[PDB]
Coordinates of C-alpha atoms and ligand atoms in Angstrom, one line a residue:
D11 CA 64.8 111.0 83.0
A12 CA 64.0 109.1 79.8
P13 CA 61.6 106.0 79.8
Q14 CA 63.6 102.8 79.8
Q15 CA 63.3 99.5 77.9
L16 CA 60.9 100.2 75.1
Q17 CA 60.4 96.9 73.4
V18 CA 58.1 94.7 71.3
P19 CA 57.0 91.8 73.5
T20 CA 57.7 88.4 72.1
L21 CA 55.7 87.8 68.8
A22 CA 53.4 90.8 69.6
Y23 CA 53.5 91.9 66.0
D24 CA 52.1 90.7 62.6
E25 CA 51.8 92.0 59.0
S26 CA 50.0 95.2 60.0
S27 CA 50.6 95.9 63.7
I28 CA 53.2 96.0 66.5
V29 CA 52.7 96.2 70.3
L30 CA 55.1 98.3 72.4
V31 CA 55.7 98.2 76.1
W32 CA 58.2 100.0 78.3
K33 CA 59.1 100.3 82.0
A34 CA 57.5 102.9 84.2
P35 CA 59.7 104.0 87.2
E36 CA 59.0 103.2 90.8
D37 CA 57.7 106.8 91.5
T38 CA 55.1 107.9 89.0
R39 CA 53.7 110.8 91.0
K40 CA 54.4 113.3 88.3
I41 CA 53.8 111.1 85.2
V42 CA 50.3 111.1 84.0
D43 CA 50.7 109.5 80.5
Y44 CA 53.2 108.5 77.8
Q45 CA 53.3 109.6 74.2
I46 CA 54.6 107.4 71.5
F47 CA 56.4 108.6 68.4
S48 CA 57.4 106.9 65.2
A49 CA 60.3 108.6 63.4
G50 CA 59.7 111.6 65.8
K51 CA 56.0 111.7 64.6
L52 CA 53.4 111.5 67.4
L53 CA 51.3 108.3 67.1
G54 CA 49.4 109.2 70.3
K55 CA 49.1 108.8 74.0
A56 CA 49.2 105.4 75.9
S57 CA 45.9 106.3 77.9
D58 CA 44.0 106.9 74.6
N59 CA 45.5 104.0 72.8
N60 CA 44.5 101.6 75.7
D61 CA 40.9 103.0 75.6
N62 CA 40.9 101.6 72.0
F63 CA 42.7 98.3 72.4
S64 CA 42.7 97.1 76.1
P65 CA 39.8 95.2 77.5
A66 CA 41.0 96.0 81.0
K67 CA 41.1 99.9 80.4
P68 CA 37.4 100.7 80.7
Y69 CA 37.3 98.8 84.0
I70 CA 40.5 100.4 85.2
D71 CA 39.1 104.0 84.4
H72 CA 35.8 103.0 86.0
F73 CA 37.6 101.9 89.2
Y74 CA 38.5 105.6 89.9
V75 CA 34.9 107.0 89.1
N76 CA 33.9 107.3 92.8
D77 CA 37.3 108.2 94.2
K78 CA 36.8 111.7 95.3
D79 CA 39.6 112.8 97.6
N80 CA 42.2 110.9 95.4
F81 CA 42.7 108.1 97.8
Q82 CA 43.7 105.5 95.1
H83 CA 47.0 105.1 93.6
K84 CA 46.7 106.3 90.0
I85 CA 48.2 103.7 87.6
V86 CA 49.9 104.6 84.4
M87 CA 49.8 102.8 81.0
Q88 CA 52.9 101.1 79.8
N89 CA 51.8 99.7 76.4
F90 CA 50.7 101.1 73.1
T91 CA 49.4 99.2 70.1
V92 CA 50.4 100.4 66.6
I93 CA 48.0 99.4 63.8
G94 CA 47.6 100.3 60.0
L95 CA 51.2 99.3 59.2
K96 CA 52.5 97.7 56.0
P97 CA 53.9 94.1 55.6
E98 CA 57.7 93.5 56.0
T99 CA 58.4 97.2 56.9
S100 CA 60.8 98.6 59.5
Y101 CA 59.5 101.4 61.8
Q102 CA 61.5 103.3 64.4
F103 CA 59.8 104.1 67.8
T104 CA 60.5 106.2 70.8
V105 CA 58.4 106.9 73.9
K106 CA 58.2 110.0 76.2
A107 CA 56.8 110.5 79.7
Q108 CA 54.1 113.1 79.9
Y109 CA 54.2 115.1 83.1
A110 CA 51.6 116.8 85.4
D111 CA 52.7 120.3 84.3
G112 CA 52.2 119.4 80.6
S113 CA 55.9 119.0 79.7
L114 CA 57.5 115.8 78.3
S115 CA 60.6 113.8 79.2
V116 CA 63.6 113.2 77.0
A117 CA 62.8 110.5 74.4
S118 CA 63.7 106.9 75.2
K119 CA 66.5 105.1 73.3
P120 CA 64.7 104.3 70.0
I121 CA 63.9 100.8 68.8
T122 CA 63.4 99.6 65.3
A123 CA 60.9 96.8 64.7
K124 CA 59.6 95.1 61.6
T125 CA 56.2 93.8 60.7
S126 CA 56.1 90.3 59.4
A127 CA 55.1 89.1 55.9
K128 CA 51.4 88.4 55.3
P129 CA 50.9 84.8 56.4
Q130 CA 49.5 81.7 54.5
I131 CA 45.9 81.7 55.8
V132 CA 44.2 78.3 56.5
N133 CA 40.5 78.4 57.3
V134 CA 39.2 75.4 59.2
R135 CA 35.9 75.5 57.2
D136 CA 38.0 74.3 54.2
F137 CA 38.6 71.0 56.0
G138 CA 34.9 70.6 56.8
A139 CA 34.6 72.4 60.2
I140 CA 31.0 73.2 60.7
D141 CA 28.8 75.1 63.3
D142 CA 25.8 72.8 62.6
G143 CA 24.8 72.0 66.2
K144 CA 26.5 68.8 66.8
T145 CA 29.4 67.8 64.3
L146 CA 32.6 67.1 66.2
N147 CA 35.2 69.2 64.5
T148 CA 38.4 67.8 66.0
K149 CA 39.6 66.1 62.8
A150 CA 38.8 69.1 60.6
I151 CA 40.6 71.5 62.9
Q152 CA 43.6 69.1 63.4
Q153 CA 43.8 68.6 59.6
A154 CA 44.0 72.4 59.1
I155 CA 46.7 72.6 61.8
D156 CA 48.6 69.6 60.3
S157 CA 48.5 71.3 56.8
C158 CA 50.3 74.4 58.2
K159 CA 53.5 75.6 56.7
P160 CA 55.8 77.7 59.0
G161 CA 54.2 81.1 59.6
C162 CA 50.7 80.0 58.8
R163 CA 47.7 81.6 60.4
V164 CA 44.9 79.1 61.1
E165 CA 41.4 80.8 61.3
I166 CA 38.4 79.7 63.1
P167 CA 35.6 82.0 61.7
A168 CA 32.3 83.0 63.4
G169 CA 30.3 80.1 64.7
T170 CA 30.4 77.6 67.5
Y171 CA 32.7 74.6 66.8
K172 CA 32.6 71.8 69.2
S173 CA 36.0 70.1 69.4
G174 CA 38.1 67.5 71.4
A175 CA 41.8 68.0 72.3
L176 CA 43.8 69.8 69.6
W177 CA 47.6 69.6 69.2
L178 CA 49.5 72.7 68.1
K179 CA 52.9 72.7 66.4
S180 CA 55.8 75.2 66.1
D181 CA 55.7 78.3 64.0
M182 CA 52.0 79.0 63.7
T183 CA 49.1 81.2 64.8
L184 CA 45.6 80.0 65.7
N185 CA 43.3 82.9 65.2
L186 CA 39.9 82.8 66.8
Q187 CA 37.8 85.4 64.9
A188 CA 35.0 87.7 66.2
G189 CA 32.0 85.5 66.8
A190 CA 34.1 82.3 67.0
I191 CA 33.4 79.9 69.9
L192 CA 35.8 76.9 70.2
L193 CA 33.6 74.6 72.4
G194 CA 34.9 71.6 74.3
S195 CA 33.5 68.2 73.7
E196 CA 31.9 66.8 76.9
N197 CA 33.1 63.3 75.9
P198 CA 36.2 62.1 78.0
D199 CA 37.4 60.1 74.9
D200 CA 38.0 63.3 73.0
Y201 CA 40.8 64.1 75.5
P202 CA 43.4 61.3 75.3
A203 CA 46.5 61.1 77.6
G204 CA 48.2 64.5 77.8
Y205 CA 51.0 64.9 80.4
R206 CA 52.4 64.5 83.9
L207 CA 52.8 67.9 85.6
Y208 CA 56.4 67.3 86.8
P209 CA 58.9 64.6 85.7
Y210 CA 58.3 62.9 89.1
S211 CA 54.5 63.2 89.0
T212 CA 52.9 59.7 88.9
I213 CA 49.4 60.3 87.6
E214 CA 48.9 61.2 84.0
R215 CA 46.5 64.0 83.2
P216 CA 44.3 64.2 80.1
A217 CA 44.9 66.5 77.2
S218 CA 43.5 70.0 77.5
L219 CA 41.3 71.5 74.8
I220 CA 44.4 73.3 73.3
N221 CA 47.8 71.7 73.6
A222 CA 51.5 72.2 72.8
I223 CA 52.7 69.0 74.4
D224 CA 55.4 66.7 73.1
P225 CA 54.7 63.1 74.2
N226 CA 58.1 62.6 75.8
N227 CA 59.7 66.0 76.3
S228 CA 59.1 69.1 78.3
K229 CA 62.4 71.0 77.7
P230 CA 62.1 74.7 76.6
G231 CA 62.5 74.7 72.8
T232 CA 60.6 71.5 72.1
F233 CA 58.3 73.9 70.3
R234 CA 58.8 77.5 69.3
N235 CA 56.9 80.5 68.1
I236 CA 53.3 79.6 69.0
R237 CA 50.7 82.3 68.8
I238 CA 47.0 82.2 69.7
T239 CA 45.1 85.3 69.0
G240 CA 41.8 87.0 68.0
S241 CA 38.7 88.1 69.9
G242 CA 36.7 84.8 69.8
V243 CA 36.0 82.6 72.8
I244 CA 37.5 79.3 74.1
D245 CA 34.9 77.5 76.1
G246 CA 36.0 74.3 77.9
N247 CA 32.5 73.0 78.6
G248 CA 33.5 72.1 82.1
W249 CA 30.6 73.1 84.3
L250 CA 26.9 74.0 84.5
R251 CA 26.0 77.7 85.3
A252 CA 25.5 78.7 88.9
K253 CA 21.9 79.2 90.3
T254 CA 22.3 82.9 89.2
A255 CA 23.7 82.0 85.8
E256 CA 24.7 85.5 84.7
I257 CA 25.4 88.8 86.4
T258 CA 25.6 92.4 85.4
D259 CA 29.1 93.6 86.3
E260 CA 30.3 97.1 87.5
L261 CA 30.3 98.4 83.9
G262 CA 26.8 97.0 83.2
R263 CA 28.3 94.2 81.1
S264 CA 27.3 90.6 81.6
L265 CA 29.5 88.0 83.2
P266 CA 28.9 84.3 83.0
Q267 CA 28.6 82.5 86.4
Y268 CA 29.9 78.8 86.7
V269 CA 28.8 76.6 89.5
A270 CA 31.4 76.3 92.4
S271 CA 31.7 72.5 92.9
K272 CA 33.7 69.9 94.9
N273 CA 34.6 66.3 94.3
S274 CA 31.4 64.9 95.9
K275 CA 29.2 67.3 94.0
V276 CA 30.7 67.1 90.5
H277 CA 28.1 64.4 89.4
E278 CA 25.4 67.1 89.8
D279 CA 27.5 70.2 88.8
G280 CA 29.9 69.1 86.0
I281 CA 29.6 68.8 82.2
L282 CA 32.9 67.6 80.8
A283 CA 34.2 67.7 84.5
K284 CA 31.4 65.3 85.6
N285 CA 31.9 62.9 82.7
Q286 CA 35.7 62.8 83.1
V287 CA 35.5 62.2 86.9
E288 CA 32.9 59.4 86.3
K289 CA 35.1 57.8 83.7
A290 CA 38.2 58.0 86.0
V291 CA 36.4 56.5 89.1
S292 CA 35.1 53.6 86.9
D293 CA 38.6 53.1 85.6
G294 CA 39.7 52.6 89.2
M295 CA 40.7 56.0 90.8
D296 CA 39.1 57.1 94.0
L297 CA 37.0 60.2 93.6
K298 CA 39.6 62.5 95.1
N299 CA 42.3 61.7 92.6
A300 CA 39.8 61.6 89.7
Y301 CA 38.6 65.1 90.6
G302 CA 42.2 66.3 91.3
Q303 CA 43.8 65.0 88.2
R304 CA 41.5 63.8 85.5
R305 CA 39.6 66.9 84.4
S306 CA 41.0 68.6 81.3
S307 CA 42.4 72.1 81.7
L308 CA 41.6 74.6 79.0
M309 CA 45.1 75.1 77.6
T310 CA 48.4 73.5 78.3
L311 CA 51.6 74.7 76.5
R312 CA 54.8 72.9 77.6
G313 CA 58.4 73.4 76.3
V314 CA 57.6 76.3 74.0
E315 CA 60.1 79.0 73.3
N316 CA 58.2 82.2 72.3
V317 CA 54.4 82.2 73.0
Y318 CA 52.0 85.1 72.2
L319 CA 48.4 84.9 73.6
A320 CA 46.2 87.8 72.7
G321 CA 42.6 89.0 72.5
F322 CA 40.6 85.8 73.2
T323 CA 38.0 85.1 75.9
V324 CA 38.4 82.1 78.2
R325 CA 35.3 80.5 79.6
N326 CA 34.2 77.4 81.5
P327 CA 37.4 75.2 81.9
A328 CA 36.9 71.7 83.2
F329 CA 40.0 72.2 85.4
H330 CA 42.7 75.0 85.0
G331 CA 42.5 77.8 82.5
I332 CA 45.8 78.7 80.7
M333 CA 48.9 76.6 81.7
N334 CA 52.5 77.4 80.7
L335 CA 54.9 74.7 81.7
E336 CA 58.6 75.1 81.0
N337 CA 58.0 77.9 78.4
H338 CA 60.4 80.8 77.7
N339 CA 59.3 84.3 76.5
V340 CA 55.5 84.1 77.0
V341 CA 53.3 87.2 76.5
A342 CA 49.5 87.2 77.4
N343 CA 48.1 90.5 76.0
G344 CA 44.4 91.5 76.5
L345 CA 43.0 88.1 77.3
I346 CA 39.5 88.0 78.9
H347 CA 39.1 85.3 81.6
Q348 CA 35.5 84.6 82.6
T349 CA 35.7 81.5 84.7
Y350 CA 34.2 82.3 88.1
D351 CA 33.6 80.1 89.9
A352 CA 34.9 76.9 88.2
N353 CA 36.7 74.8 90.8
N354 CA 40.5 75.1 90.1
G355 CA 39.8 77.4 87.1
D356 CA 42.8 79.7 87.6
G357 CA 43.5 82.3 84.9
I358 CA 47.1 81.7 83.9
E359 CA 49.5 79.3 85.5
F360 CA 53.2 79.8 85.0
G361 CA 55.1 76.6 85.9
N362 CA 59.0 76.6 85.8
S363 CA 58.8 79.1 83.0
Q364 CA 61.1 82.1 82.3
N365 CA 60.6 85.6 81.0
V366 CA 56.8 85.9 81.2
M367 CA 54.5 89.0 80.6
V368 CA 50.9 89.6 81.2
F369 CA 49.2 93.0 80.3
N370 CA 45.8 94.3 79.5
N371 CA 44.1 91.2 80.9
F372 CA 40.7 91.2 82.4
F373 CA 40.5 88.4 85.2
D374 CA 37.2 87.0 86.7
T375 CA 38.5 83.5 87.7
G376 CA 37.3 80.5 89.6
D377 CA 40.7 80.2 91.3
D378 CA 43.9 82.2 91.3
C379 CA 44.1 84.9 88.6
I380 CA 47.9 84.5 88.0
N381 CA 49.7 81.6 89.7
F382 CA 53.5 80.8 89.8
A383 CA 54.7 77.3 90.3
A384 CA 58.2 75.7 90.4
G385 CA 57.9 72.0 91.5
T386 CA 57.9 70.3 94.9
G387 CA 60.6 68.6 97.1
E388 CA 64.2 67.4 96.5
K389 CA 63.7 66.6 92.7
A390 CA 62.3 70.1 92.0
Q391 CA 65.6 71.3 90.6
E392 CA 65.3 68.7 87.8
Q393 CA 63.7 71.8 86.3
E394 CA 64.4 75.5 85.7
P395 CA 63.5 78.1 88.3
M396 CA 60.2 80.0 87.7
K397 CA 62.1 83.2 86.8
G398 CA 61.2 86.6 85.3
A399 CA 57.5 87.7 85.3
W400 CA 56.1 91.2 84.5
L401 CA 52.4 91.7 85.2
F402 CA 51.1 95.2 84.4
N403 CA 48.1 97.2 83.3
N404 CA 45.7 94.3 84.2
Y405 CA 42.3 94.4 85.8
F406 CA 41.8 91.7 88.5
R407 CA 38.1 91.2 89.3
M408 CA 37.1 88.1 91.3
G409 CA 39.7 85.4 91.9
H410 CA 41.7 83.8 94.8
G411 CA 44.6 86.1 94.5
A412 CA 45.8 88.4 91.9
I413 CA 49.5 87.3 92.1
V414 CA 50.0 83.9 93.8
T415 CA 53.6 82.4 94.4
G416 CA 52.9 79.4 94.4
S417 CA 52.7 76.6 97.1
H418 CA 54.9 74.8 94.6
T419 CA 58.2 76.7 95.2
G420 CA 60.8 73.8 94.8
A421 CA 63.0 75.2 92.0
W422 CA 62.4 78.9 93.1
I423 CA 59.9 81.5 92.0
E424 CA 61.9 84.7 91.4
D425 CA 62.2 88.1 89.8
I426 CA 58.4 88.9 89.7
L427 CA 57.2 92.5 89.0
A428 CA 53.5 93.3 89.2
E429 CA 52.9 97.1 88.7
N430 CA 50.2 99.4 87.5
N431 CA 47.3 97.0 88.0
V432 CA 43.9 97.5 89.5
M433 CA 42.1 94.9 91.7
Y434 CA 38.4 94.9 92.5
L435 CA 36.6 92.2 94.5
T436 CA 39.6 89.9 94.3
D437 CA 40.3 87.8 97.4
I438 CA 43.9 88.9 98.0
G439 CA 46.5 91.1 96.1
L440 CA 49.7 89.2 96.8
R441 CA 49.7 85.6 98.1
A442 CA 53.0 83.7 99.0
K443 CA 52.7 80.2 100.3
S444 CA 54.9 77.2 100.8
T445 CA 55.7 74.4 103.3
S446 CA 59.2 73.3 104.6
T447 CA 59.6 70.0 102.7
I448 CA 58.7 71.7 99.3
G449 CA 62.0 73.5 99.3
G450 CA 63.1 76.6 97.3
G451 CA 60.7 79.4 97.9
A452 CA 60.3 82.9 96.3
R453 CA 62.5 85.9 96.3
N454 CA 62.9 89.2 94.5
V455 CA 59.1 89.8 94.3
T456 CA 57.9 93.4 93.8
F457 CA 54.2 94.4 94.1
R458 CA 54.0 98.1 93.5
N459 CA 51.9 101.0 92.0
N460 CA 48.7 99.0 92.3
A461 CA 45.3 100.1 93.5
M462 CA 42.7 97.8 95.2
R463 CA 39.1 98.1 96.2
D464 CA 36.7 95.8 98.1
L465 CA 39.1 92.9 98.5
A466 CA 37.2 89.8 99.8
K467 CA 39.9 88.5 102.1
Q468 CA 43.2 90.3 102.8
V469 CA 45.8 92.5 101.1
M470 CA 49.0 90.4 101.4
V471 CA 49.6 87.0 102.9
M472 CA 53.0 85.3 103.3
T473 CA 52.7 81.8 104.9
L474 CA 55.3 79.1 105.7
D475 CA 54.3 75.9 107.4
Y476 CA 56.5 73.1 108.9
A477 CA 56.5 69.8 108.8
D478 CA 58.5 66.6 108.8
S479 CA 58.2 62.9 108.5
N480 CA 54.8 63.8 110.0
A481 CA 54.1 63.7 106.3
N482 CA 51.6 62.2 103.9
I483 CA 53.8 63.5 101.1
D484 CA 54.3 62.1 97.6
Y485 CA 57.6 63.7 96.6
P486 CA 61.0 63.3 98.4
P487 CA 61.4 66.2 100.9
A488 CA 63.8 69.0 100.2
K489 CA 67.2 69.1 102.0
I490 CA 67.1 72.9 102.2
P491 CA 63.7 74.0 103.5
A492 CA 61.4 76.5 101.7
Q493 CA 61.9 80.3 102.4
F494 CA 60.6 83.7 101.4
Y495 CA 62.8 86.8 101.2
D496 CA 63.3 90.0 99.3
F497 CA 59.6 91.0 99.0
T498 CA 58.8 94.6 98.2
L499 CA 55.3 96.2 98.7
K500 CA 55.4 99.8 97.6
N501 CA 53.0 102.6 96.6
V502 CA 49.9 100.5 97.0
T503 CA 46.4 101.6 98.1
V504 CA 43.5 99.5 99.3
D505 CA 40.0 100.7 100.1
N506 CA 37.9 98.1 101.9
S507 CA 38.9 94.5 102.4
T508 CA 35.8 92.8 103.6
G509 CA 37.3 89.6 105.2
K510 CA 37.6 89.0 108.9
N511 CA 41.2 87.8 108.6
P512 CA 44.3 90.1 109.0
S513 CA 44.9 92.7 106.2
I514 CA 48.6 92.0 106.2
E515 CA 49.3 88.5 107.4
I516 CA 52.8 87.1 107.7
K517 CA 53.2 83.8 109.4
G518 CA 55.9 81.1 109.8
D519 CA 57.1 78.7 112.5
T520 CA 60.1 80.2 114.4
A521 CA 60.3 77.2 116.8
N522 CA 61.0 75.0 113.8
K523 CA 63.4 77.7 112.3
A524 CA 60.8 78.8 109.6
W525 CA 60.8 82.6 109.1
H526 CA 60.5 85.2 106.4
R527 CA 63.1 87.9 106.0
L528 CA 63.8 91.0 104.0
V529 CA 60.2 92.3 103.6
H530 CA 60.2 96.0 102.6
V531 CA 56.9 97.8 102.8
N532 CA 56.9 101.5 101.8
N533 CA 54.1 104.1 101.2
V534 CA 50.9 102.1 101.5
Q535 CA 47.4 103.3 102.6
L536 CA 44.8 100.9 103.9
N537 CA 41.3 102.0 104.5
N538 CA 38.5 99.9 106.1
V539 CA 40.7 96.8 106.6
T540 CA 41.3 94.7 109.8
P541 CA 44.6 94.9 111.8
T542 CA 47.8 93.1 110.7
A543 CA 49.2 89.8 112.1
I544 CA 52.8 89.5 111.4
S545 CA 54.9 86.5 112.6
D546 CA 58.2 84.9 112.0
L547 CA 59.8 87.8 110.3
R548 CA 63.2 89.3 110.4
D549 CA 65.2 92.1 108.8
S550 CA 62.2 93.9 107.5
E551 CA 60.6 97.4 107.7
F552 CA 57.2 99.0 107.3
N553 CA 57.5 102.7 106.3
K554 CA 54.6 105.2 105.7
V555 CA 51.9 102.6 106.2
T556 CA 48.7 104.5 107.1
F557 CA 45.6 102.7 108.3
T558 CA 42.3 104.7 108.2
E559 CA 38.8 103.4 109.2
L560 CA 40.6 100.4 110.9
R561 CA 38.3 97.5 111.6
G562 CA 39.9 97.1 115.1
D563 CA 41.8 99.0 117.8
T564 CA 45.4 99.1 116.6
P565 CA 46.9 98.2 113.2
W566 CA 50.2 96.6 114.2
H567 CA 50.4 93.1 115.8
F568 CA 53.9 91.7 115.9
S569 CA 55.3 88.5 117.5
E570 CA 58.4 86.4 116.9
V571 CA 60.2 89.2 115.0
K572 CA 63.9 90.1 114.7
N573 CA 65.5 93.2 113.2
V574 CA 62.2 94.7 112.0
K575 CA 61.0 98.2 112.0
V576 CA 58.3 100.6 111.5
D577 CA 59.1 103.7 110.1
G578 CA 61.5 104.0 111.3
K579 CA 61.8 102.3 114.6
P580 CA 62.6 99.0 116.0
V581 CA 59.8 96.6 116.8
Ligands
LIG18 NI1 42.7 110.6 76.8
LIG19 NI1 28.5 78.3 78.8
LIG20 NI1 36.8 80.5 93.3
LIG21 NI1 43.0 76.8 96.3

């Protein structure tokens, strides 16, 4: 059957290049690659193209190096980058599946796609931006952005440019060139009032280092067509290095290591984080809220329709890494996150956003790699559901969970597909969490065709707490309680999970009517992991789940279950 849904991701094109992605089927056992054709002429194979353009790809190939016996699910590439094109030119494209036996599928339905016109180019050095070792460049960089006409590319060339909060606008690209480091100011005054997370949030957070934030309005379409690209680094200047400041990773490359702090330690551990918490406490906040709310995140983009993030390295946030709040049509392509172990330094947060795509990312994060959020309590639905996410061809290294939905489930997290990824040293593959009074939940979540090694904690955890007016809770409680259902875990392999907690852990509170339902687990092999602990679950089935080298006596531990089934036989 022909590959489906060949497409250019939102804004993933410029004057000389176009990125293509397509769906891979559920069952890829026979598919070993994809070949891409332009006007029926072979441009190449997806595997080879990713070797060239994806920062995840060498890590992903390397993951299989010691996999004699073919234990690990072999992921396929679902993207191809076309370069060397001409400005304002249409190109037609098809894709074919390449099979084990060497034959090819029928072509996909073609697409035509057109490169853009060569953009006005604005260099920040022409506004007096300077890498001189302590000029603050905020004004220079903001002047360059302000001078932008629609379609402008703003360039930060090689060099380290210290900067305070910057404010982006519609219809522009900020390009961070090779050798460019955008460095956060450590001065809290360089980050003025930014935003409140939700409309009903009461504490104002500072601006991030990079912002698309309208002072009054969060609605999707407040901004449009924002692109941040290039192979340079955005460094938030949040934290000191850890005692072991740098490590050599599994490819022999160096990773930075950021101190893992807490609210009572930030005065010794923080840089911007320290200074911002100090300023907030002296302004009157207790230390807990100052730590929790008053550190600048690296990037906050709110109300943007069409966002393309590509190529850049993220380091050292004072708080979160990349935040998307109420955006539509977001693509993150080939970002490199090196933020281990900055406290709350998650890779990408998606908050009440729709139609989001992450591919070719490398994640080494201080918190969750990819987190989904949708508000809290009765007011949550003041906002869009968190709906439509497609996460593929990424390499997850360290982090609190590769795919996390969310704790904040109020308006619903839904229609999430994470396929053809590799995880190595990550805490957890799939994490789903909520409490009763948050409301909403998550549904239609598929985690499939992923391979995992040396997980630090557990494979998959779905947890639902009660309570009640037992609550020290800031939002109004939800009338309909939080639930999870319609979760699919298929064609997944894990070798080693070094935590002492349950490999597959599903937990609720059936007494208080809190259960999960409609969990479908098919064709999963778990080697050298602990037994499962599955609670509060109904109308679910586990088929062709094989445990080998079990760290315990029996894999299956069930309690408080209704209409569930292994494979194929009632529990
Ligand atoms: Ni090859
Ligand atoms: Ni640094
Ligand atoms: Ni961490
Ligand atoms: Ni956490």
